[PDB]
Amino acid sequence: FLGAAGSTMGAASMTLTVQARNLLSGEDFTIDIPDVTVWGIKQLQARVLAVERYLRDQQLLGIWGCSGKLICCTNVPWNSSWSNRNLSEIWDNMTWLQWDKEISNYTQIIYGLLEESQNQQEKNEQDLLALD
Amino acid sequence: FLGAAGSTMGAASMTLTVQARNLLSGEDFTIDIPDVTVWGIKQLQARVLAVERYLRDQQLLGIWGCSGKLICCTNVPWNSSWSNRNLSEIWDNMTWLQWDKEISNYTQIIYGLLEESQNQQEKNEQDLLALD
Amino acid sequence: QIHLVQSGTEVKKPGSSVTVSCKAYGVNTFGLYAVNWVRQAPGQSLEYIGQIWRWKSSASHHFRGRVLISAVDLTGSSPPISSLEIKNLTSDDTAVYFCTTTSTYDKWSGLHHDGVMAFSSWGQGTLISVSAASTKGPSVFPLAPSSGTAALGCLVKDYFPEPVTVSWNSGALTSGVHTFPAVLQSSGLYSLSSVVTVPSTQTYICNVNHKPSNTKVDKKVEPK
């Protein structure tokens, strides 16, 4: 649970599943048996926005070239203008917190390449290749 | 956003992603910070039925031969009795609003071919073909 | 709000050791605020010296070990104070030194980049002049106009230390006056000039006050 946040990106890929589990899920099944008008909304407001924030992430995962959780790849080429770096300088020498810091400017740009350039243009491409 | 509703089905396939985005998502994250007994249920009743209506659509997408959003194909043959037409008479000469109008009788029939004839009989077929 | 008050002007001789202090007013602690020491050479650009961040002193490969940055947090009688020491002073260290700080609490702020950062708050600045010289009195000479229009002024030479205040008619003549900045002569003494533009009798005068040498001497100006 977040243990590799201080570690390098290369080491952070091993514990990736643990973060996926706990973040994704509520399974406490505790409370809500006897009603209250007051406090109960408060324990509602938190978990309702939680599932709204949850489906928000799942949409990006679906509309992109993933359609599945954890890791998935894409046909989007990595631009030189986006963090021009060494491969060993990223995973081995650099950390995720340090990484997301620089990409902050190109983050919104990259998102467009996933939904527009791919799953809009890829699925249509697939339809044309599946006809023959 | 719905801009091609008046346009032909052929042109309506380009902006398909836009409709998918906005319809799918709530990301306002506005309100619900300070509690009210009265009005608050009203702003609840709307978004709660919204996510219920949402998962309803996602189920059909899953139980059918799609398992993914936007466009996906299937092994169900198009019946002649279902809108006997010309291919250029559908996408190029006809519109979606005009299209769903005629299929209204066969809509419930087609739905059956997707869940029963395919993913019930296809996945079982897949299990028999993956053994060897 | 945030106020950075540094020490006074230090004039020190080569080979000696200098210590400047920076009092940081308005800062809750140096835990949430990184302190960087930057110097500026006269007529030249800015140069990064070192920093103290997370209570860890650091400095550029230029000054490694030769520069010592120490700081103490907020106390009950005074705001957080940092101090910079430079031993083995040379003539190239005469740059103006600045005490700076930056808010590090925001983890996704563009201000900082893992030790290397920008500088949000700037101090008053502290000038360090490195020269081997003893205090001396100013020499005042008149500059007489020969004859377009006319121009006359007074010349102040060989004084130490700075500054000196030059007036005209005891502040009566405030217009058309341009006072040139002191120049450092090869002898280690300062020299400047004050000139006034006159058209076409009034018999102007010069008012010179040098406080370190306590010389209030005043010289007149006569046309040849």
Next chain:
Amino acid sequence: DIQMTQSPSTLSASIGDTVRISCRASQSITGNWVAWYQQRPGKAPRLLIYRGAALLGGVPSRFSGSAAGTDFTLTIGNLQAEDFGTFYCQQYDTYPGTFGQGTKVEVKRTVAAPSVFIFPPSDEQLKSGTASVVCLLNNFYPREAKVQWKVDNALQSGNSQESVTEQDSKDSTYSLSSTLTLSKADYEKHKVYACEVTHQGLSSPVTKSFNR
């Protein structure tokens, strides 16, 4: 160790004009770690923009940054009086941080020729054993100017010091002085001393001399 290059070193711009000051790094900076500072004469430098486009709170909207690869540029629209001064670009991308050459934004106005005046050494100074000839340059635009010393139609190197005033508050002009420091013995060995100045205002060469 990055080296930041600014262009130009100084520029002339008027009020209302749109000023663009660029900067280039020895390598490509990505993540856009670049800062732009403003410094008024006699005052401490103030932070304006960080991360190349991100403006600090309290700064007018007239300032706009741009950051792409090796090339960086700061854009200032609708120039005003308080904006004039010296600007520096800085990279915090890597240890340690390095600044740029600096860019002096200087007030624009019609080019003005200086009025040159030359002052012979005072009598009391001659008794000290030294003689200083002072060449004067009155209000002139821009600051850049040349002053050479000819003794009996011969140039002099060394023993020469010049001084320049700050830009005038209203006139927006500069003033320049020139100091020639020589001994008494060498002073008596020559006859005519001349001060040669060249500036954009003159549009001709000027020389002021005295026959003592």
Next chain:
Amino acid sequence: NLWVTVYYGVPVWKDAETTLFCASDAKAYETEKHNVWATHACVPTDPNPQEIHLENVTEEFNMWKNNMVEQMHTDIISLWDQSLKPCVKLTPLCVTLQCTNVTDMRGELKNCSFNMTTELRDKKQKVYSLFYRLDVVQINNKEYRLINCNTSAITQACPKVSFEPIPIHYCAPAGFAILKCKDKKFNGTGPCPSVSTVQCTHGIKPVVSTQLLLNGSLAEEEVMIRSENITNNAKNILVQFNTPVQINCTRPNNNTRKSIRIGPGQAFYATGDIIGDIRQAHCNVSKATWNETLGKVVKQLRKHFGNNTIIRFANSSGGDLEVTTHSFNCGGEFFYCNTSGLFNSTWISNTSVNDSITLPCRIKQIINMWQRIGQAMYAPPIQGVIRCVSNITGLILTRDGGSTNSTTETFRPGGGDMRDNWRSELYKYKVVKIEPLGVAPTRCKRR
């Protein structure tokens, strides 16, 4: 060469604010007594709370900017009103009170006779009660009235529920996380070398008190000194003790409950006659234990105010009763204690120039805490003598503005804001939201 790839569940979080819920440890529910304090439906705590130590991580904490405090403060307030809503409202108690001096200590108790409405709306009821001097005010024999009637309304707390503080773990919903600072010495500000994460905070007893932190968490090694702005005398100084200080607060009056009937259906509990010791409420503090603590604390203040200086203690300056005295709840009753005896001392550089000590305490049934207007709560009488033993885990202190800064400094007990009380337990916690979505370049591409 490479290609972009979506990673889900990357270790990335950002500082944010969310709505936190409670946890009761699933034992407090078996404690029953008809919804003690918070716990009614309160969430059962996970029997095995998880604490994950994050290696190679340094996070900067600020306890004064912590948002968990503001929620907890509003929680106790919101919790308070909901307890008073179903209960019996005392509205027609504003009847004139004819009082007289009780049979010593300048007649602190008043025996009051008054007219009252019965179950029937026809005939009134002539009955007497016993109120403390703080609960009544005369209006011009001796005639008195309720002290709260001119200011606000009033309602009686139900005898079924108890004000007894029970451990409450604050936890975060899905998508969020809570950071814990594991260092032994932490003042609440600056970077934290060792940081761990937990789903639920530790056991926190919402004990509302003034001038004394009661039933709190002990510090590690040296005692801790915490203040928002230290050199500023306008900001209170929070102290955390190492060893707990034994404190005794009792009600040396053995009482009885009248349980008068003001129907239909409602019954008020009046204070009957006192049978037992004739005494005023008192608070005991062991002279040896307080002194030992004081000597260790006074040395810690000199890590700021300088190695050598004179530090003098004195009782409260002045203000509301809640500020000037030690206010708390024991056995359902609300005590207000005089701390002037403990704070009378003068210390040298390392030293200061009997077997017990006592502190006179006053009792007030009708209270408005948190500067609340419109709602006043009446503390119901308790059968028998109440005795309680608690830990003193810290103080709320203020520094004088008079300076003479380079000479000497004097410190006095603070009060007012109850958020400081919660900041005492919440200094090591803060709320952040986790960002799972991430992108990284790799060769895999796609077919």
Next chain:
Amino acid sequence: IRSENITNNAKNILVQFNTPVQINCTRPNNNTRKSIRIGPGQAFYATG
């Protein structure tokens, strides 16, 4: 001009203007508030 059923006189006729009409409505009585106390805790504002 808008109406649900026009020829029907039982239905109201809604009109929408082009240019706004300036209207002034004032209370030409300069008053004071008594703020009488009908406690405990409640206070009514009477017209003085």
